[PDB]
Amino acid sequence: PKKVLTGVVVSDKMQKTVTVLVERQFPHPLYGKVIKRSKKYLAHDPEEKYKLGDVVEIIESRPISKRKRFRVLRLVESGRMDLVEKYLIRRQNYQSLSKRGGKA
Amino acid sequence: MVKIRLARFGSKHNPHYRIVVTDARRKRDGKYIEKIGYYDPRKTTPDWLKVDVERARYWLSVGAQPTDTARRLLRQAGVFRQE
Amino acid sequence: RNLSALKRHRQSLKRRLRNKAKKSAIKTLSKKAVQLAQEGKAEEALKIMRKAESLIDKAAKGSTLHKNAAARRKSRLMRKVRQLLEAAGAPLIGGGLSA
Amino acid sequence: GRYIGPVCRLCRREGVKLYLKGERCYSPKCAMERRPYPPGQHGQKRARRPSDYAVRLREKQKLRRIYGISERQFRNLFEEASKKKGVTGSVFLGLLESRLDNVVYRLGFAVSRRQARQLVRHGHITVNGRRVDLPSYRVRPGDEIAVAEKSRNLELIRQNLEAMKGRKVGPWLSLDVEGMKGKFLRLPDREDLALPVNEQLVIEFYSR
RNA sequence: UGGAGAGUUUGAUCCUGGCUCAGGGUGAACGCUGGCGGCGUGCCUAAGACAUGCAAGUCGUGCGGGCCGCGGGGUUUUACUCCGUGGUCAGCGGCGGACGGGUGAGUAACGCGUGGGUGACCUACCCGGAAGAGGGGGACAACCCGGGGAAACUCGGGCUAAUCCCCCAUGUGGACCCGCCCCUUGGGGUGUGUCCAAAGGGCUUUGCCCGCUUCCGGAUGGGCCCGCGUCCCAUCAGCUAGUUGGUGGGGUAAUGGCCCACCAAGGCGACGACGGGUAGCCGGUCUGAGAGGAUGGCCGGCCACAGGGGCACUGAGACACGGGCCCCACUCCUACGGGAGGCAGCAGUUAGGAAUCUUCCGCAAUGGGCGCAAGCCUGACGGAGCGACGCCGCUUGGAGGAAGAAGCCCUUCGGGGUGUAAACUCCUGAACCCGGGACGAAACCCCCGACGAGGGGACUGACGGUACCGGGGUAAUAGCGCCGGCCAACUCCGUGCCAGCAGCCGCGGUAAUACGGAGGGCGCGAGCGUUACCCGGAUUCACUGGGCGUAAAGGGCGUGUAGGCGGCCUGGGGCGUCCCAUGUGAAAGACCACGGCUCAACCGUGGGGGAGCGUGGGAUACGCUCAGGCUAGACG
Ligand SMILES: [K+]
Ligand SMILES: [K+]
Ligand SMILES: [K+]
Ligand SMILES: [K+]
Ligand SMILES: [K+]
Ligand SMILES: [K+]
Ligand SMILES: [K+]
Ligand SMILES: [K+]
Ligand SMILES: [K+]
Ligand SMILES: [K+]
Ligand SMILES: [K+]
Ligand SMILES: [K+]
Ligand SMILES: [K+]
Ligand SMILES: [K+]
Ligand SMILES: [K+]
Ligand SMILES: [K+]
Ligand SMILES: [K+]
Ligand SMILES: [K+]
Ligand SMILES: [Mg+2]
Ligand SMILES: [Mg+2]
Ligand SMILES: [Mg+2]
Ligand SMILES: [Mg+2]
Ligand SMILES: [Mg+2]
Ligand SMILES: [Mg+2]
Ligand SMILES: [Mg+2]
Ligand SMILES: [Mg+2]
Ligand SMILES: [Mg+2]
Ligand SMILES: [Mg+2]
Ligand SMILES: [Mg+2]
Ligand SMILES: [Mg+2]
Ligand SMILES: [Mg+2]
Ligand SMILES: [Mg+2]
Ligand SMILES: [Mg+2]
Ligand SMILES: [Mg+2]
Ligand SMILES: [Mg+2]
Ligand SMILES: [Mg+2]
Ligand SMILES: [Mg+2]
Ligand SMILES: [Mg+2]
Ligand SMILES: [Mg+2]
Ligand SMILES: [Mg+2]
Ligand SMILES: [Mg+2]
Ligand SMILES: [Mg+2]
Ligand SMILES: [Mg+2]
Ligand SMILES: [Mg+2]
Ligand SMILES: [Mg+2]
Ligand SMILES: [Mg+2]
Ligand SMILES: [Mg+2]
Ligand SMILES: [Mg+2]
Ligand SMILES: [Mg+2]
Ligand SMILES: [Mg+2]
Ligand SMILES: [Mg+2]
Ligand SMILES: [Mg+2]
Ligand SMILES: [Mg+2]
Ligand SMILES: [Mg+2]
Ligand SMILES: [Mg+2]
Ligand SMILES: [Mg+2]
Ligand SMILES: [Mg+2]
Ligand SMILES: [Mg+2]
Ligand SMILES: [Mg+2]
Ligand SMILES: [Mg+2]
Ligand SMILES: [Mg+2]
Ligand SMILES: [Mg+2]
Ligand SMILES: [Mg+2]
Ligand SMILES: [Mg+2]
Ligand SMILES: [Mg+2]
Ligand SMILES: [Mg+2]
Ligand SMILES: [Mg+2]
Ligand SMILES: [Mg+2]
Ligand SMILES: [Mg+2]
Ligand SMILES: [Mg+2]
Ligand SMILES: [Mg+2]
Ligand SMILES: [Mg+2]
Ligand SMILES: [Mg+2]
Ligand SMILES: [Mg+2]
Ligand SMILES: [Mg+2]
Ligand SMILES: [Mg+2]
Ligand SMILES: [Mg+2]
Ligand SMILES: [Mg+2]
Ligand SMILES: [Mg+2]
């Protein structure tokens, strides 16, 4: 079956394309403890129909571009930046570990 | 085309083939599509030839082309015996 | 040395030529009809579009285009012509297009 | 290369008597009568308390020196026994006891196991009517071990099979002395055998 | 059904802790030794370089010719010219040359594995179904004539056949544009317009056969896409401009920045981007009680590559190992202009290396290509050869009998040992130019039948005179390591911190079971040792299964970011978790059973298990999430 994944829209800055952050949980192959892993997907959005905080269902689709093989199958629940913010902060976090660094 | 032939499986001087259904282009002892019999050229045992005739019939019904020796054995097990 | 199956190379060149030539015609006629269609000249734009259609299919009769390469061509051709005739066109000769 | 060397000297080193000559290892000459002590310039000196390893090693050497098998083949059998279902100790002794050359010895067709070995190699023996010249051939229950007709009239086979008249045979075997036939009734149980061997020590030796 | 530990820090002890050994393994190599056979296996280094031969052709039932030959015709005769037929040569044309065979360089990646997607696709030959093949026209080799080059090879001119190429027709049908309907990414139906078919050949020639055309489907094979999984370094922390997305176009069988034009300013990263190192991945293999570790030779699957780089042509299929073009490096021929090459195919040579084989036999069998067939090709394959390289089997004797050794070589000088051991008596009978002698091989073909089903029939074996059977018949290779402890086996002489041994602890300085020799002994035996490497023991990277006061180890202290973890009660959802059914989990291997070769190794048949993922159904205690509530934590 074409794959269906659920994630949060963390990016809307593209024409007809939104970035969907999908989370996945699973026991660690050797240490057992359940660990959360995740991947960002570039789903296709023809009508600019979705915005941030939107939890959608991504569906496996025929390639729309390089780096883009999924379409937004539907909205699960609207607005909720608790997730977007989370993502964003972790990103802002990076703005540190290097030669300089913020203060957070 | 897809064929029904023999695949060597015995040992040196101890041949034992498998009546097989594979693409004509594969190694002979290569990866077949389906085993449908087996043959012991030297009849070292009373069971030196078996052939899932129902299956042999299937493959032939869809284009399987038997080797001559393949056909010969299949016939010996009445794959064509319409009598 | 001397592998007589260089006759294949020998032959490929003759084929290469045959194909090569059929395509030029196709390309040249297509451009020609697309050019006329655009300039609004309808009756002749179609007339030629029609030749191109025929030539294309024939190209696919043997191993020049074959497959759905022919279909793409005719498709894109009948596409651009019908559209370019959106300059008050009115399919005069109603050649290949089925309005 | 089945050993081949002085034998009534292994018994001496092994403390116990290994009948590796059948005859003579009975007479007042098996040496175990006069010189039961190990061979060599130190055979009589005071003994030194053997090591756990020593005990296990000697015990393995005893059990294996009896059937006169190679350490290679001997080991092969033991491994096969560990793998089989059933108490390794016994199963192992069963397999050992199933070697044709051995069975030929149990039926009395020959004095010693060594002699019985040669009798197989030379085709004087027959399993189910077909010749079998492999001393290691594994006899199965029901198989009838015999003497090739052509060999039946051999001077040795006579004196030998004669000496077996009215003589007892292991419960898992059975021989018709006249026709010179014999049947392997079934695998002997630990109880059926009575060897100067604690096979448990052997299992341990191959556990190290 | 499964799990052993030992030596070594001290005067002694306990602990910590490293080193080391006992076990199993290897495509091995080296030393001493070496008899037979079966089955396996053998360039691990220079993807270095290669002489030579062979490794892909096949169709005369698609076509026309040349050379050589025989026969028969038209004449009164000759010349000239017509037909038939044989050998041979290539050419035109077709199918194959994209498979089969080699290798592991590159690659850390949708390459591989596993499970899925394609309404985004192709598939020669094969199979099933439907429909069809009317008419005309053209050219280029061969061949003929001439020109250029040293050669390779090449330029021009003329003639000609076809299942070669083209035109018109017929339109079962199919393709494209537009509309409509049903479906839902480009799936299917429908209407109008437009566009598109074909090749002939063979006869037991008046019907059969081989073949051709269009279409729908089957089968097999394949492209592309996606989830998850896939080594080391963070002494690599930021990376990116076709770079991320858009619109239009190009290109393909087809999706896609695959490519292009234009627009937007995005994309990726600590869940490790980018960079560096290393490496084909897998089924499996070795080891381990298991978890795990290590590995990927042989065999099967996938990928990649064909002297190094780039490229496309022809094709159903290639960007093509024995096709083509250009650049490079190198070898070769050269009349210096210019040409010819590519063993990572079999075998062989040379180089490198500790090290890896025959320039073998056969096409008989299995399999592949072409052919109507006969048959042709097939270094694929089936076999033999060489190498204890591995595994298995086997032999050097069996039964009876204690000379007894200048010297080897023990002693209490009484004796003890080698030892039933003994070219010495009886038995069997490995070897052995001695008789017979194989399965593997019955098809294609032919005839009858109806070229069907059936049924009869010529033919054909490399291995091989091999195996195996029967006869006769000789008593007929033994070596290597070790003997202080770990670790099975002790004495004499020699030597005197020397000569030397040594895995670790150590041994030798004049009584040495530790050096060398000898007798004796232990282990294993056509082998035995050594070196190297892998797993083990090592709970010594500890998930199973460890630690940090003084043994190595608490950060100098805090603050808090990400993250990890989260009190009590109820409800929803059902992600984690658990259960059921189902698909998948190739073969080989492994395990069990039975079976074939006298056994075994080896092999055949059958059986059982199986995690992971997909699908459908179900459960809700715990974890998660949403909602509500509490007050024992927290804070005020
Ligand atoms: K940054
Ligand atoms: K001429
Ligand atoms: K129409
Ligand atoms: K088809
Ligand atoms: K298909
Ligand atoms: K596919
Ligand atoms: K586009
Ligand atoms: K295992
Ligand atoms: K593995
Ligand atoms: K690996
Ligand atoms: K054929
Ligand atoms: K004989
Ligand atoms: K002798
Ligand atoms: K001295
Ligand atoms: K000594
Ligand atoms: K180790
Ligand atoms: K410190
Ligand atoms: K510090
Ligand atoms: Mg947007
Ligand atoms: Mg050809
Ligand atoms: Mg032009
Ligand atoms: Mg057992
Ligand atoms: Mg210590
Ligand atoms: Mg010490
Ligand atoms: Mg100390
Ligand atoms: Mg000390
Ligand atoms: Mg002290
Ligand atoms: Mg220790
Ligand atoms: Mg030698
Ligand atoms: Mg061999
Ligand atoms: Mg190599
Ligand atoms: Mg080389
Ligand atoms: Mg040849
Ligand atoms: Mg001719
Ligand atoms: Mg020819
Ligand atoms: Mg290949
Ligand atoms: Mg590689
Ligand atoms: Mg890298
Ligand atoms: Mg995948
Ligand atoms: Mg083709
Ligand atoms: Mg058809
Ligand atoms: Mg003509
Ligand atoms: Mg010419
Ligand atoms: Mg000309
Ligand atoms: Mg044609
Ligand atoms: Mg119609
Ligand atoms: Mg037409
Ligand atoms: Mg005809
Ligand atoms: Mg596009
Ligand atoms: Mg397209
Ligand atoms: Mg293509
Ligand atoms: Mg790009
Ligand atoms: Mg490499
Ligand atoms: Mg372990
Ligand atoms: Mg195991
Ligand atoms: Mg392989
Ligand atoms: Mg090379
Ligand atoms: Mg290249
Ligand atoms: Mg093409
Ligand atoms: Mg090629
Ligand atoms: Mg390639
Ligand atoms: Mg080549
Ligand atoms: Mg070679
Ligand atoms: Mg050298
Ligand atoms: Mg052949
Ligand atoms: Mg063939
Ligand atoms: Mg052996
Ligand atoms: Mg003596
Ligand atoms: Mg004797
Ligand atoms: Mg005699
Ligand atoms: Mg026969
Ligand atoms: Mg007939
Ligand atoms: Mg017949
Ligand atoms: Mg033939
Ligand atoms: Mg005899
Ligand atoms: Mg000892
Ligand atoms: Mg000295
Ligand atoms: Mg001394
Ligand atoms: Mg010494």
Ligand SMILES: [Mg+2]
């Ligand atoms: Mg460990």
Ligand SMILES: [Mg+2]
């Ligand atoms: Mg732990």
Ligand SMILES: [Mg+2]
């Ligand atoms: Mg510790």
Ligand SMILES: [Mg+2]
């Ligand atoms: Mg200290």
Ligand SMILES: [Mg+2]
């Ligand atoms: Mg400390």
Ligand SMILES: [Mg+2]
């Ligand atoms: Mg502190």
Ligand SMILES: [Mg+2]
């Ligand atoms: Mg926090």
Ligand SMILES: [Mg+2]
């Ligand atoms: Mg909680």
Ligand SMILES: [Mg+2]
């Ligand atoms: Mg939480």
Ligand SMILES: [Mg+2]
């Ligand atoms: Mg709840």
Ligand SMILES: [Mg+2]
């Ligand atoms: Mg659930």
Ligand SMILES: [Mg+2]
């Ligand atoms: Mg399952």
Ligand SMILES: [Mg+2]
């Ligand atoms: Mg399997």
Ligand SMILES: [Mg+2]
């Ligand atoms: Mg058997």
Ligand SMILES: [Mg+2]
């Ligand atoms: Mg067996």
Ligand SMILES: [Mg+2]
């Ligand atoms: Mg099996």
